[PDB]
Amino acid sequence: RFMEPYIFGSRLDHDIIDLEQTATHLQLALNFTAHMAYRKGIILFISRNRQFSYLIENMARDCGEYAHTRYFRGGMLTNARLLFGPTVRLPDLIIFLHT
RNA sequence: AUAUACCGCCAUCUUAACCCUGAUGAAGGCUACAAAGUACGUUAGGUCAAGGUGUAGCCC
Numbered sequence: 001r002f003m004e005p006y007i008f009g010s011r012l013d014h015d016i017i018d019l020e021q022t023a024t025h026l027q028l029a030l031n032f033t034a035h036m037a038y039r040k041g042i043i044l045f046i047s048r049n050r051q052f053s054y055l056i057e058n059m060a061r062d063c064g065e066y067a068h069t070r071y072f073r074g075g076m077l078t079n080a081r082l083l084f085g086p087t088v089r090l091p092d093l094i095i096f097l098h099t
Numbered sequence: 100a101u102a103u104a105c106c107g108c109c110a111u112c113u114u115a116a117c118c119c120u121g122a123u124g125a126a127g128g129c130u131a132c133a134a135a136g137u138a139c140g141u142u143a144g145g146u147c148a149a150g151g152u153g154u155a156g157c158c159c
């Protein structure tokens with residue numbers, strides 16, 4: 001339901017995403033990502049689609065950022081101090097290629 | 100006579116945290132082609148034979 005305002009219409013029962021809105025949303029998201037990378041924030045890419053795990057991990061390594069394409073263990077973020085250490089620094093921005 | 104006086108020696112028995120979910124109810128938390136889970140005393144005991152320190156008994 002919450003995706004309806006972003007849908008241009010249904011073509012023979014297939015939803016078409018309105019790309020005029022995608023352009024503005026992508027503009028905002030890319031601007032935010034660039035500003036966070038300028039501030040030396042930790043950026044974590046996340047995606048559980050196994051078809052693109054290798055691509056996303058390579059891209060994360062290439063841009064000097066972080067990836068988590070594997071099974072997401074309970075408490076990675078909310079229990080990070082127990083899992084990583086008391087002084088671990090969490091990501092400042094998380095990007096989902098697949099939500 | 101007493102270790103049913105102690106000591107020695109033998110033997111008997113006794114000796115968590117964090118994080119999530121449920122409307123932050125009682126409560127619950129697994130799937131790998133992965134979906135919240137991760138970290139000494141005790142004994143009416145034996146032994147007075149390879150050992151001791153005491154205590155009492157009778158003493159026409």
Ligand SMILES: [Mg+2]
Nearest residue numbers: 102103144145
């Ligand atoms: Mg005895």
